Amino acid sequence: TLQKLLSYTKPDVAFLVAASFFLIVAALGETFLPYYTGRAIDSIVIQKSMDQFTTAVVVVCLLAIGSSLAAGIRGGIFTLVFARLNIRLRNCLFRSLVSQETSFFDENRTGDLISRLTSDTTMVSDLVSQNINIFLRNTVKVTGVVVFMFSLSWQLSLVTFMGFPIIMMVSNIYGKYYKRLSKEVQSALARASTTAEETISAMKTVRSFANEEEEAEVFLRKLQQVYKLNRKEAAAYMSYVWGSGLTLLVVQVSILYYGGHLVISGQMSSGNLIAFIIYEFVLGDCMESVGSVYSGLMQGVGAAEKVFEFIDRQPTMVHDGSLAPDHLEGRVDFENVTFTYRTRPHTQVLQNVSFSLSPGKVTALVGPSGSGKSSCVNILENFYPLQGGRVLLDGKPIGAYDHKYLHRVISLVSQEPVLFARSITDNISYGLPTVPFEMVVEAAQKANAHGFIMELQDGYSTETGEKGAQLSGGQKQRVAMARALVRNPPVLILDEATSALDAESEYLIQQAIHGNLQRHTVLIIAHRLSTVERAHLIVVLDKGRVVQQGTHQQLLAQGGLYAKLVQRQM
Amino acid sequence: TLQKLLSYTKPDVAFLVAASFFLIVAALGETFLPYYTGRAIDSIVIQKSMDQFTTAVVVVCLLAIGSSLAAGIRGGIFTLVFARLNIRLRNCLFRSLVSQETSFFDENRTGDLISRLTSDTTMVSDLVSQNINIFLRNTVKVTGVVVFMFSLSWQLSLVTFMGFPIIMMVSNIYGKYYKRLSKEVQSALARASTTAEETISAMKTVRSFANEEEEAEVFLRKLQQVYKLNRKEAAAYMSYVWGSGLTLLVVQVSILYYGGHLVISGQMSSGNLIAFIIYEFVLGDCMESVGSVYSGLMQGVGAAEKVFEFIDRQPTMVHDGSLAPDHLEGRVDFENVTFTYRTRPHTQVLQNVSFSLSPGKVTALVGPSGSGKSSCVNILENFYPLQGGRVLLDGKPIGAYDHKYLHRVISLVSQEPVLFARSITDNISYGLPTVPFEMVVEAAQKANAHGFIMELQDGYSTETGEKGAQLSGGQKQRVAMARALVRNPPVLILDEATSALDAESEYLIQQAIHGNLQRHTVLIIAHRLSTVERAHLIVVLDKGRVVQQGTHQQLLAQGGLYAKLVQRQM
Numbered sequence A, B: 001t002l003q004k005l006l007s008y009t010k011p012d013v014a015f016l017v018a019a020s021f022f023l024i025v026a027a028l029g030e031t032f033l034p035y036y037t038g039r040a041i042d043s044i045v046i047q048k049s050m051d052q053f054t055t056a057v058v059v060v061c062l063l064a065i066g067s068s069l070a071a072g073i074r075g076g077i078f079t080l081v082f083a084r085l086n087i088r089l090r091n092c093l094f095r096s097l098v099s100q101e102t103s104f105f106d107e108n109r110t111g112d113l114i115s116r117l118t119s120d121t122t123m124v125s126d127l128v129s130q131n132i133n134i135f136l137r138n139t140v141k142v143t144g145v146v147v148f149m150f151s152l153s154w155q156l157s158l159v160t161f162m163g164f165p166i167i168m169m170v171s172n173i174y175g176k177y178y179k180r181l182s183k184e185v186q187s188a189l190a191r192a193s194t195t196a197e198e199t200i201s202a203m204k205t206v207r208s209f210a211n212e213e214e215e216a217e218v219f220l221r222k223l224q225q226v227y228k229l230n231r232k233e234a235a236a237y238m239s240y241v242w243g244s245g246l247t248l249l250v251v252q253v254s255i256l257y258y259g260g261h262l263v264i265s266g267q268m269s270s271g272n273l274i275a276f277i278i279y280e281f282v283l284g285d286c287m288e289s290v291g292s293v294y295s296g297l298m299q300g301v302g303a304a305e306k307v308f309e310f311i312d313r314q315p316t317m318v319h320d321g322s323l324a325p326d327h328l329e330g331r332v333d334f335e336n337v338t339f340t341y342r343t344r345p346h347t348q349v350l351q352n353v354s355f356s357l358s359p360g361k362v363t364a365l366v367g368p369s370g371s372g373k374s375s376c377v378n379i380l381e382n383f384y385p386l387q388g389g390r391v392l393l394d395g396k397p398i399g400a401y402d403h404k405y406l407h408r409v410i411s412l413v414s415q416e417p418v419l420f421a422r423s424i425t426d427n428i429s430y431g432l433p434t435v436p437f438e439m440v441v442e443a444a445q446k447a448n449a450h451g452f453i454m455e456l457q458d459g460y461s462t463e464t465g466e467k468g469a470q471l472s473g474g475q476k477q478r479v480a481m482a483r484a485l486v487r488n489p490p491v492l493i494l495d496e497a498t499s500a501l502d503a504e505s506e507y508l509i510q511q512a513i514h515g516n517l518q519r520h521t522v523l524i525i526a527h528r529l530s531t532v533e534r535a536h537l538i539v540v541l542d543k544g545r546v547v548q549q550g551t552h553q554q555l556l557a558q559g560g561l562y563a564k565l566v567q568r569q570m
């Protein structure tokens, strides 16, 4: 997958080569430093002079200042690459995530698709800011240090290189054993704590049995076992500290003592021995840090397969519409449509339904509250495709009209009309470009929204603050109705609350003034039967099939599947 | 606090004094080491001989071995103190988190009252062990190091003490500024992620407007602000590294050069210069470690307050009642009780109810399906207190009796009878010990619990696996029904949920043996109006006063609110 992660850095090679060059300079400065420290000490003790001027100068000016400056500049350019990579991953992932067909969002969760947008992209940008930085820096420094301490005195080099594996071996053995015993104690305490968790979380029954003493005592037993487990963990820790400490001591004193014999023999200088000891410590620390960072880098490159998982997934439907004639009537028809989801294809919610809607006239819908009525709402909004059948808007199917045009000639208001945390002069005129104020005023009046709006804390621009949860259901549905009416839509798809505790004048006036005195091929989805009393063609349905048509007077006349419900209401 | 926290270590004084002494020894050895290292280098350079061998000995054996062994023993004894303190706190906390009156369990949560237990007692023991370890160790070692590097050469100590505060001040300044800018960048990225989250989490209403593109654009610009906020953070990081590095360098080079002149002038000996530089490094490291760890210690004692608020919180309702007669009659009478909650004391959910149960005679209780009927069982089980009224039980009220004897005379069967993770021989004697297994199977046959026990995959003594889901509704109902008979209770209580998943076999076994044949003053709080199949009395009340009594044939005659329920339902 690293053939991809390169391609999302290809517009950053300028920053990358600048940062890499200054990284290499920083490492070389910090690995040429100890040799000249050794030359300084040797200039003190061997030739007692003021050659120390020139050597302290060589240390302080070029090597030290160069290391510090290059370190700062490498830090700067890597922070810049971090932010630019973060921004471009977030933008590409979103812009190709918000263009999937809705069944995508029905399958996958929402907390997961926000984890994969904040935390995962943070990890896959730290993979290039931090971990590759540290790993490459310390690799260059380790190579430099090894070559130096070979050039200085290869006897001590051979000694310490036969030495370091012994330290690593004993430390790793005892550390792994102690870690195992520590994990065992942690698991024992959690298992012993789950009993207290349950007896706390179900205190009613225990109270009913007067059995609290025999829960304190079982906790005392299930804990008093952990102590006898823990003594062994203490002993293992003690022996681990002894083992690591004494092996490190033996290697270090062997180094210093062989070095002493060399310096007295006359095969080195005091400066080169001090240089060798400092190089030994630097090599130890750098080996430690390189060994540490591999966990983080493995975790990062594992996280880099969640972003690229979604950042290019082909959508399963195309919005290939082209037509957009400005003049419609609104002949919503259905041609034996049967529809099922993509989540459970064997169950059925609509079977060969074929019912029409007369232009410019109300046409409600109702069912047994157990069959699929909402599914006709979700099919007409062109969310999901169809299995069998076809739907058409004034002759041509809805698969042919232009996308924004199609959802501008239809509308929707629903059971839970969500209002995004914005201004109410924006929530109303949501999807269409900045229509002026007076149209919004006429719209809010035409849904009894303008009533309360002027009585809020500012009027129209009262942004729906407090994380967008301040308004109540009545104003909610009325402002939603205002939102659909702004577009002047030839069709409308309306839904009604199950409690129906609102003013309720809006729906009857929609059957009377809002949609009856104008071209509005309104459809209704009614749970509360307070609107059955007036309609045009109540097409009651069940099991995904049409059973009755015509006015609900004939439903009362042919009292099948409907007259049973009106007695269930009273 | 600190005083009680000390009072919960009082049994550990032996372990504490032993570990403290060994901590002192380890710190003293590790601070005596570098002086003798400097003496070794001295003997290499100044008087080139094998007088070095004495000093390599006095470094490798005494100081190094002693330091490492003492560190091992200190680590071991602090692990033992950690586990003992953790155990004692958890035991005492759970001992006094189960003896509180149940209103205290209603008010508080249950996720908190386990997170508190586990993680907070972990923190309180971790405070003492880990951080008093680190703080006390580094205090002793820093005192020793300062005394030495004053003993060696005082001009050098005065120069490095003019040096270290300047390093600390410059690092402090620039680190504060850089952390400020990094925090602002994190906040801006989180804000833009929230504006993307409100569109991910509300996809359907967005799709309804063909408004994904403007959402992608809003996200793009809300990101392209972060880049401009981030360049300033890059410059802050640059200057932070430059400032810290250059100050540290100037201090170090001034010290090394002044030491060079000191060695040239005969004022010192090169071994003491190496000793002084090693002491400078050690002192810097330990100062940084203490400066890190004080914050963790303060956080630890800030968490250590959450335990002692519950350790000795006195219980509200004390079960000081102490009485247990041999035999009894079993006449329960709710006598003008004035019961009141403590979670919403404005309302009076039960005010002066008056009705008496009869020995062996069923007394069903149903109500208006919204009013307070579910409280009577909690009144009977002596959960909550009561202001006025006295439930007289055979000469004495319930409050006078023994706790265990009380809940051994009375039982209950909840709606969803909670059954903890045990075996189905444990549960059928929860509080009652030393039960013969044939009594268990007999009192399981009396409620038809023998059915799904033998066919379950382990025989009789099957453990309730998967955290209590290997049984179902009617199963666990028959289980709890088997519970309420193993104790031979002269009083019984029952309840049942609105689902009524059992196929009415519960009522067949109610009227079978322990409702008519055996003497059990059965009460019942039944939904769905199913208990009217048979009754020896019926109480229907509302909010404290009883409106209807007598057998249900009077309820047919006195058709108030009752005869309409059987016809409205289906």
Ligand SMILES: CCCCCCCCCCCCCCCCCC(=O)O[C@@H](COC(=O)CCCCCCCCCCCCCCC)COP(=O)(O)OC[C@H](O)CO
Pocket: A033, A034, A037, A059, A064, A248, A249, A252, A253, A256, A274, A277, A278, A281, A282, B034, B037, B059, B064, B248, B249, B252, B253, B256, B274, B277, B278, B281, B282
């Ligand atoms: C960083 C900016 C530097 C600017 C220039 C300053 C010039 C003076 C400093 C020289 C540059 C060194 C830069 C990198 C060094 C980092 C590693 C380090 O500091 O290690 C020292 C400190 O490491 C420690 O923490 C020491 C603690 C243990 C003491 C070790 C004693 C000798 C080992 C034998 C004892 C055996 C027991 C071993 C237990 C670890 C080791 O001291 P040394 O005496 O070996 O050499 C230092 C030299 O004399 C400076 O002039």
